[PDB]
Amino acid sequence: HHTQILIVEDEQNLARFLELELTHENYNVDTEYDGQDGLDKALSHYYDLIILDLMLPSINGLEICRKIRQQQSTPIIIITAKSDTYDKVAGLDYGADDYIVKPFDIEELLARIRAILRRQP
Ligand SMILES: [Mg+2]
């Protein structure tokens, strides 16, 4: 009944902050701090939207994005300190629906989540 979000982010302070802020907006949030654990969770459960850090232990977020896209059209937002156009283009072309440079303001993330989920059936 709740919208379900997965966050794969190894900086645990930010992961916890995003979880709290999204929960306050009535999302249900799962978090994983390891890239392999995050991919496994994304493939084994239905999420409405997945948020992926790029520099993660075990598996990089771009590889997580690619493996998810073999199996699912689930919306993905990449969050990362990699701000070069090269990196933005790579993430989007791997299947991400949006790409936000860290550090970012929570209100922008929430607005981009709403914009993406607006179009899902
Ligand atoms: Mg990281």
Q: How far is the CA of 5 from the centre of ligand 1 (A)?
A: 18
Q: How far is the CA of 9 from the centre of ligand 1 (A)?
A: 6
- Cα 32 to Cα 16, 56, 76, 84, 97, distances in angstroms: 10, 10, 15, 26, 20
Experimental method: X-ray
Which residue range is the domain that position 14 belongs to? 1-121
Q: How far is the CA of 46 from the centre of ligand 1 (A)?
A: 23
Q: How far is the CA of 1 from the centre of ligand 1 (A)?
A: 30
Give me 97's structure tokens.
């629906």
User: What's the structural domain count of the chain?
Assistant: 1
Burial class (CB within 10 angstroms; exposed 0-12, middle 13-18, buried 19+) of 85: exposed
- Cα 90 to Cα 44, 54, 99, distances in angstroms: 25, 11, 10
Q: How far is the CA of 8 from the centre of ligand 1 (A)?
A: 9
Euclidean distance between CA atoms 18 and 70, whole angstroms: 27
Q: What is the CATH number of the domain that holds 32?
A: 3.40.50.2300
